[PDB]
């Protein structure tokens, strides 16, 4: 592609995370791209890997709940992350009830450009670091 400036500019997700944890997680980033009819996250289904939107577009759709009609369609802005729950999942070792779940169902309508992130590698680097303490602050 190009490889220049990485997203996660001012993302809250990586608030507690440390640089070392970033690079590590970054080093995990694998070369992959999403095409038409490409499902990133699925509501109700487990999450194997997370996708960090670097630069592209996507469509958010829901099934459960809703209002006026059916399936509330929507769009995500730039830097929008899906299955973010995974991030926490890894950050949460206590949570050992199978892979996490997505918040909504997103798809790829146009050529998207982002990387992939496996929970395993995540949790690994997550636990390895393990930086929380007796809730200080």
The CATH code of the domain that includes 124 is: 2.60.120.10
- The experimental technique used to determine this model is NMR
| Residues flagged as binding site | 13-131
Tokens 């469509």 correspond to 59
| Residues flagged as binding site for a nucleoside 3',5'-cyclic phosphate | 13-131
Is 1 among the domain residues? no
- Which of 86, 106, 93, 99 is closest to 39 using CA atoms? 106
Is 6 among the domain residues? no
The pair of structure tokens assigned to 45 is 């289904």
Is 26 among the domain residues? yes
Instruction: Decide if 53 contacts 112 (C-beta within 8 A).
Output: yes
Within the chain, residue ranges assigned H as helices are: 19-28, 85-91, 119-129
């Amino acid at each position: 592609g190009s490889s220049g400036s990485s997203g996660v500019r001012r993302v809250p997700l990586f608030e507690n995370m440390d640089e070392r944890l970033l690079d590590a997680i970054c080093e995990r980033l694998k070369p992959c791209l999403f095409t038409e009819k490409s499902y990133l996250v699925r509501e109700g289904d487990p999450v194997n890997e997370m996708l960090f939107i670097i630069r592209g577009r996507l469509e958010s759709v829901t099934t459960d709940g809703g209002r006026s009609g059916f399936y509330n369609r929507s769009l995500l802005k730039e830097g929008d992350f899906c299955g973010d729950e995974l991030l926490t999942w890894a950050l949460d070792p206590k949570s050992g009830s199978n892979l996490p779940s997505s918040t909504r169902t997103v798809k790829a309508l146009t050529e998207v450009e982002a990387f992939a992130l496996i929970a395993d590698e995540l949790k690994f680097v997550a636990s390895q670091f393990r930086r929380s303490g007796p809730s200080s602050g």
